[PDB]
Structure 1
């Protein structure tokens, strides 16, 4: 029942925000509105709904009550005014960019981006007259310099693969604030529990709820959180007319179920990651480790200023790159070889022999991916079992 406004604690709000059982027959768990359409008692009522004069529903693609609860909750957790639920993280990203951008507009992007986001920008909306430019969001001088009068939005992830490179959200937001640019941050890795970009100046945040938010890898979903003004536009244009990325109320319910243990799951992911990162740091076979929790992390101070905890993701490089990375991966027995992250199950991937195996050392390298870089999404399994798997696989990678 306990609302938000950020009064009750985070765990309380992640469980109760926006829902009062007394308002729904006393049902402790909200009933799921698995219906596409809603009916009107009167024609004058339906009209009032369409004209926004009366609060109600009429069609789930535009708005569904079960989705509305998820949206209100996520908004509360992120500290924003409004939320919007979508069929996937890409759905949230595209619906967002498709409505804020038009030909002639420029979009300043972080140096690296999720593959599909990159693909979408360069071979998608980029091919429709939108200008794109990659800049280091940590370098506020370089950013301020790339700012033009056509820069309409600034988009990036933080941390961003492959080295978990961070950006100065507040620094970026201040520059964008003076230029009239819109800042949107993909806060998938941290979640509102570890980082809240909106509180640092960002205008909007996007999430692939398919990851940590759901936490159990049984749904693909996306979330957008920001001001009412901005979110309304994305709902009514990006979502409604473009993309049509509608989230199933069933999936919205499973996501809210996942969010109920968000703080607890993130606490374990991070606790587990820290021990694994430190164990890796002691391995002679490991050349470099990209984990915000290690004191030698290049952006350690900035990370600590934006994230409450170092996260559950680890990237590291094996000396003797490809081959050691391939042997390692193939020896794993608890960790799963798969793409994705934020599941209870621990996952691992070695781009050099997996996603970018088709490239050549040169291609790969001249593109940012090392030959021995493996990324792990540390799960919730027992740390010693995980350490034992990595230890056994490290011996095999030899």
Structure 2
């Protein structure tokens, strides 16, 4: 079996089948023609390998999908217009009124909003459980429980889930487990190999790597993904990925291993620096010995990742002064870009939450999230250093 970097570059593509083209040609076309109507009928009915319409399927998208499937150790992949496209397309097809879904305690803002203000308002029961607490999860299960959805690590406080433990329990009850693997990527964590049924990504982040596209990926079993393609995507979201964006995403994935290594190495130095600093109160970085879930993080993630969260003594006031003083880090939402980014999740990425919902689900007061980029660490260090002095 070829290695991870080899498959990220080559999997599912032989140049000899596309006139020798080293880079696959981009199928920037909306529709496909048939040699006969009989051939066409067969494509819609499902009984033929082939194409008809890019919302359903497209060869550039198919390559991305097969390749992502290989990196995650899944059977099938699906490409969508956004991470939210992936999550909604997935959850819209698996759930109906009277089904319940068990969620991780903390979710990405628009995931939270979709669950509570979106699909939750169409008769689907929601309940939040700590997915590190196995006995609390077992107690939460009902016969209505159809899906278990969570992020690990969780946006934006780094809370881990026991994916093996959760999936053991889900097998007993006949529940489908969906893991948002955006933060880690398949290079660092493969929830399907820990017993998850489906993984979703915002391919907008690390998988793209360069901040120039919005995209989503689902990977899992052939049977789940075929349902998500033919119902969620085709009929319920229409979250179709541009073939052009899919080729940039494939371009990004070719350096995923190298990029993640550098995100991790830079993030480690910055986190360790931030530990030894008088202005810092807490730190959530999985690679610090201090990290409360350090043991669980190491059983699931091969490296501690590119994201750091921390609080300052000074609270919300020092937050503003720190961020506004950054000269190399940029003040923005998003993560997993070559550029280093800094954000305040309560006013920005999780601004769908009210002040009570902020506090209820572990989203703090003076919390600053860093997405550590690929710049020279000395420059990043100097910038964080001078920004701490400015926050007094």
Using the alignment, how far apart are the partners of 1:358 and 1:101 within structure 2? 23
Q: Is the 8 A contact 1:352 1:372 kept in 2?
A: no
Q: Aligned to 1:122, what secondary structure does the other structure show? A: helix
- Residue 169 (structure 1) aligned to one of 163, 173, 193: 163
* Mapped partners of 1:363, 1:31: distance in 2: 47
- What do residues 201-231 of structure 1 show as CA deviations (whole Å, max 9, x unaligned)? 0000000000000000000000000000000
* Cα displacement (A) at 1:53: 2.1
Q: Higher relative CO (CA 8 A, sep ≥ 6), structure 1 or 2? A: 2
User: Is 1:146 the counterpart of 2:133 in the alignment?
Assistant: no
SS in structure 1 at match of 2:177: strand
Match of 2:382 in 1: 388
Q: CA deviation at 1:51?
A: 2.2
How many Å apart are 1:372 and its aligned residue?
1.6
Deviation per residue, 1:335-380 (Å, 9 max, x gap): 0000000000000012356557899977754553322210000000
Deviates most, 43-52 or 137-146: 43-52
Over 3 Å counting, the alpha-carbon distance change for 1:367 and 1:44 in structure 2 is: closer
| Conserved? CA contact 2:87–2:200, under 8 Å | yes
1:30 aligns with one of 19, 24, 41: 24
Q: Is the 8 A contact 1:321 1:370 kept in 2?
A: no
**2: distance between equivalents of 1:358 and 1:194?**
30
Structure 1's 128 and 362: CA in aligned 2 closer, same or farther, altered over 3 A?
closer
Task: Decide whether the 8 Å contact of 2:319 with 2:366 is kept in 1.
Answer: yes
- Unpaired runs of at least 5, structure 2: none
User: C-alpha offsets along residues 107-139 of structure 1, whole Å, 9 cap, x if unaligned?
Assistant: 000000000000000010000000000000000
Question: For each residue in 1:266-295, what CA deviation from the matched residue of structure 2 results, as whole angstroms up to 9, or x when unmatched?
Answer: 000000000000000010110110000001
Structure 2: distance between partners of 1:363 and 1:17: 44
Instruction: Please list the CA deviations of residues 60-93 of structure 1 after superposition, one character each: whole Å capped at 9, or x if unmatched.
Output: 0000000000000000000000000000000000
Q: Deviations over 1:312-340 (max 9, x none)?
A: 00001101211111100000010000000
The corresponding residue for 1:238 is: 232
* Cα distance change on mapping 1:60 and 1:292 into 2, 3 Å: same
Cα distance in 2 for residues equivalent to 1:359 and 1:229 = 35
Partner of residue 249, structure 1: 243
Q: Give aligned pairs, total.
A: 392
SS at match of 2:235: coil
C-alpha distance in structure 2 between counterparts of 1:132 and 1:283, whole Å: 40
- TM-score when normalising by structure 1: 0.96
Q: CA offsets, 1:117-170, max 9 Å, x none?
A: 000000100000000000000000000000000000000000003320000000
8 Å CA contact retained: 1:322, 1:353: no
Q: Do the aligned partners of 2:210 and 2:338 also contact (CA within 8 Å) in 1? A: yes
Q: 1:55 to 1:35 in 2, by over 3 A?
A: same
Corresponding residue SS for 2:112: helix
Instruction: Decide whether aligned partners of structure 1 residues 81 and 292 sit closer, same or farther in structure 2, where only a CA change above 3 A counts.
Output: same
Partner of 1:129: 123
Distance 1:294 1:117 in 2: 28
Structure 2 equivalent of residue 359 of structure 1: 353
Partner of 2:173: 179
C-alpha distance 168-366 of structure 1, shift in aligned 2 (>3 A): closer
Cα RMSD over matched residues?
A: 1.5
C-alpha contact 1:361 1:371 (8 A) present in aligned 2: no
Q: Aligned equivalents of 1:274 and 1:30: distance in 2?
A: 36
Counterpart secondary structure, 2:89: helix
CA distance in 2, matches of 1:196, 1:245: 25
CA distance in 2, matches of 1:135, 1:351: 21
What is the distance in 1 between the residues matched to 2:240 and 2:131? 31
Sort the Cα spacing of 1:323 and 1:240 in 2 relative to 1 into closer, same or farther, 3 A: same
Task: Name stretches of at least 5 consecutive residues in structure 1 with no aligned partner.
Answer: 1-6
Displacement of 1:296: 1.1
- Distance in 2 (alpha carbons) for counterparts of 1:97 and 1:329: 36
Tell me if structure 1 keeps the 8 A contact 2:109–2:350. Answer: no
Q: TM-score, normalised by structure 2?
A: 0.98
* Secondary structure of the corresponding residue to residue 120 of structure 1: helix
